């Protein structure tokens, strides 16, 4: 048993971490004070859930988690909310003023003055780890903290923990719920500085979550709470293999092994089904075939793009609920005949399948209905490069006028970092094009 | 987090007093500073503008500055007069005679240090001061001259905080003296260099609104300031009220100001109110907010393009409808929004409406059409300056014609810079 | 279409299905970067204060 | 009031569509990079499909199907027909074809196996070669491949149709251009008006180095042909005259002898790629106008030769067709304040 430390950075990181850890606690039967009755090994263990929770002598199960924001208001709500007892104070770290939606203010100015405190607190968790395998880092692309402080932190983690795996859950920027006009700048900057420090990144585009909430949850104007319960469902689906008995994706190195052949193209697309409103009176429960088939509708992707005009490098199917292999194989067999699924020549056409028989846990009073079976597909398609194109385009429009650049330069950043980052992204986009056309 | 507020001169103090009346009412605080509202949205961020004092009292974080005491006294005697701490009243005795130089170079200099003393005292009682907002006119002497002196002193002592101003611009339609263009052109030269964000409150636009649409035949300064305080409560609601967007002075700078100098904002407001019964629909609110007739800087927005826009809707209403209508405005007029700043229009919603309205909308545009305002001032300036008229009031206080020439040039540069991006 | 590495347990099972065969900088450099930017920042502040002193 | 954006100024058909849209007073044109468009008449090359459908509050629509190039470039279409079960190598309306790469996968070693059986069986062994100006029709392979390698792009070579149907008077060749519009619902609409691009030079089965009586391109015929326009204005015979000729000379209708096969071919091709390109559940929508090029043999059997993804119309038919594109492709999606298309379904 090998431990996992989750790091939540900025507003989007912290609020999503709240949602995930609430889910986790529901799933493992951990109460809000941190007590798990089914845990007969009191005070310790090397169980599967222990990769995410440590135990105290008093039978308290405590998330291997650090929350870090450069201003206090959001983590203060953790400190005073339902799961206050769950987290030990030293793990909730706040600053005095945020990064003002400014990557360079989070990376350089305010980052430099809190990076060492954060690393010390992270070391205090690592030191409680018999065999730490690495880090799950949650953050937005668009926030000033979310981008700038996160990239600084990733650089340092690579130095203080060089053999350890680092995974990203990254919120991609969408106008409908965005908070700043400079989010493309920050997105590109943080992607470029973090690219070589991340082994596998799951990008979630707020545009997709927003439309999924509207279409399938009949939520007219989704909030962050709606978005985050849905995203936490997806995240839980992705991590369940680190927290439960199984043979698929059991350590972080296996995510890279199974999902990232070329190290630079490490952005797997996540597709999730079914998403059913709790207010649906009569729901006909969907079959393995129906939900597996939904895995290939763009409208269920965490990022809107068209995998038909790309190539696959890998594909993993994670089921939860009443699923057995032969039904999965049947579903796949018919899907292959009816759908455009092209793998790259140097890769097998196939699917690694993971099934956990416990169906998804849903937040009592939430928006999602309980269901008998659900699936998250993780596929490394080149089609996700569409999302980089969009982003890079929005950058190129602004940067051609050097609009807003003075705010970055005034923080100590040099104009050249902009064009450097953009050049890296042009590389990335070309790598995708060459792998997939 | 904390904002320090400074009101300087006759206009500065009259509008500042009205601002504190209005937002004190919005946050449930009474003229004695004792909270008496019902809800708790009213207090979440009450410290951004108020210090807490003994006995659960709330005391505005506000310094009152003038070179003559007539207006300041009028404030103390006025409605909310006793809510301000008396130590924050800083005044001289000789006035400034509508003379920028007296405010900036001679009389002002004599008083500015003690104002900075009060500033320092307020700021060291701050946990994380984010910066300052100043209210002042630009056509008089104390507000324009001493206020810009204050601004560059504050910038020296606090170079890493935000300087924001509400700056009332002079109009011959509402005019105290002929030297107002001189006073204004000097001040804009200061503003362009030492503020992060300025709300251009045009006394012309205020007059035209009171007259052409509020059907007031003889607008007073009261009728003008009611518009001003509506606008001020509007543009500061995302600062003092907890919402989804946790806003402050610096984020507003970062997102509104693509280039440092072009930081002069056109504010607007709807529904336009005089000192009614029909509820406005969200499509109506949205169409009015964008109407040239609802904007406090007499500029035709169709004569330029919007660089950035930020809009605030106050009231209980449909977020969905607001989203649809804002998108409709942009998609049906995209010509007037620069294409090289994607998604340059942001919207915020506050459940709490202003006093006496179930719904309302406040507009903050960084338009290149603002150049019209400065062109207006520059013309008036030149008309006099080319005959060196009325200059002796200024050279008598030590100033050189050269300084006038410099300030004129910097404003004409500001106009050219706006014209640069109107055609990009 | 063949089904391999089937592993199974009381919580669930996993397996693979094939359909067709195949056709960092140091801590030193980092604090150097952070300090260079602090230097550009301090310099711009000093230009600002010197101008204000004029 | 709807907005659109023009990114291919060199398109005659969509230039006419721009004019028609503006003259409704319900469509206003934006600058080519303004992303707040409802409609996009995209560029022919590297159209940015990845940037469509991400503009909240805008239903967006484009005049091209991403992926349709597989049908509309010669090597691609040969690959698609041979490998797609719906069409198969046993396809009875596509000529034997092979994909050959220059000297500088390839199919010339599979070509030769068939060509030499054609030469030994003493069958007509004429073959034509082309890619997507530079055409060679020959009787022996070592001229074909020798020519392919002097150029430097992938080529297809395919069994030349040695017994075409010849129009009299004149004893001349022709091809049939059909215009097909696929809408965002994937309705396949054949335009009622097709055109016969004829040759003006009697069909000389002797030396295949003269291309004037073997290739039916409107360009080569105006410049290098003797009597361009002797029989029909601009070397273009429309459908009424051709149906009359079939009735008089051959005792059949155009519908019976030929059109049934053309509707069958069109539907088969489009239905084949529909899963790869459909935008039924996509965040943006597509329509597209295609030009299917057909050749009839002397037995009244229809053959498909090229599908063109960006065709021009015939000057007589521009008005009616472009108006139809607006009616069924654009106003279907963006309503304003006896059809000229046959819908293909079976
Ligand atoms: N999906 C989701 N997105 C969020 C959430 N909170 C913020 N965002 C997105 O994150 C982006 C803004 O980044 P933030 O995390 O809020 O900013 P930050 O990291 O806190 O950095 P600062 O600039 O210092 O405030 C916008 O695109 C938001 O839509 C959230 O709770 N859920
Ligand atoms: N909008 C508005 N403008 C004012 C008010 N009082 C003065 N002004 C304008 O301010 C300018 C005169 O400056 P003033 O503030 O009286 O002089 P100061 O006290 O020396 O700074 C003229 O343009 C006046 O029209 C007021 O209450 N409201
Ligand atoms: C152009 O994009 C932006 C992005 C963010 C902002 N922020 C920081 C705001 N700040 C303040 Cl004080 N009030 C606002 C009122 C409405 C609104 F929508 C935003 C703001 C403004 C414009
Ligand atoms: Ca235990
Ligand atoms: Cl290590
Ligand atoms: Mg924040
Ligand atoms: Mg006065």
PDB file of C-alpha atoms in Angstrom, chain A residues 273-274 284-295 300 331 335 339 373 375:
ATOM      1  CA  UNK A 273     -22.371   8.535 -18.483  1.00  0.00           C
ATOM      2  CA  UNK A 274     -25.143   8.469 -17.357  1.00  0.00           C
ATOM      3  CA  UNK A 284     -35.683   3.842 -17.325  1.00  0.00           C
ATOM      4  CA  UNK A 285     -32.351   2.476 -16.143  1.00  0.00           C
ATOM      5  CA  UNK A 286     -29.754   2.354 -18.894  1.00  0.00           C
ATOM      6  CA  UNK A 287     -27.929  -0.820 -19.897  1.00  0.00           C
ATOM      7  CA  UNK A 288     -24.232  -1.489 -20.216  1.00  0.00           C
ATOM      8  CA  UNK A 289     -24.653  -1.030 -23.955  1.00  0.00           C
ATOM      9  CA  UNK A 290     -26.447   2.302 -23.674  1.00  0.00           C
ATOM     10  CA  UNK A 291     -23.941   3.867 -21.220  1.00  0.00           C
ATOM     11  CA  UNK A 292     -20.902   2.465 -23.022  1.00  0.00           C
ATOM     12  CA  UNK A 293     -22.325   3.882 -26.223  1.00  0.00           C
ATOM     13  CA  UNK A 294     -22.829   7.257 -24.579  1.00  0.00           C
ATOM     14  CA  UNK A 295     -19.068   7.209 -23.951  1.00  0.00           C
ATOM     15  CA  UNK A 300     -20.814  13.606 -22.595  1.00  0.00           C
ATOM     16  CA  UNK A 331     -21.305  -3.556 -26.120  1.00  0.00           C
ATOM     17  CA  UNK A 335     -19.937  -0.108 -31.005  1.00  0.00           C
ATOM     18  CA  UNK A 339     -18.436   4.089 -34.878  1.00  0.00           C
ATOM     19  CA  UNK A 373     -24.486   1.231 -13.519  1.00  0.00           C
ATOM     20  CA  UNK A 375     -18.985   4.362 -16.646  1.00  0.00           C
TER      21      UNK A 375
END
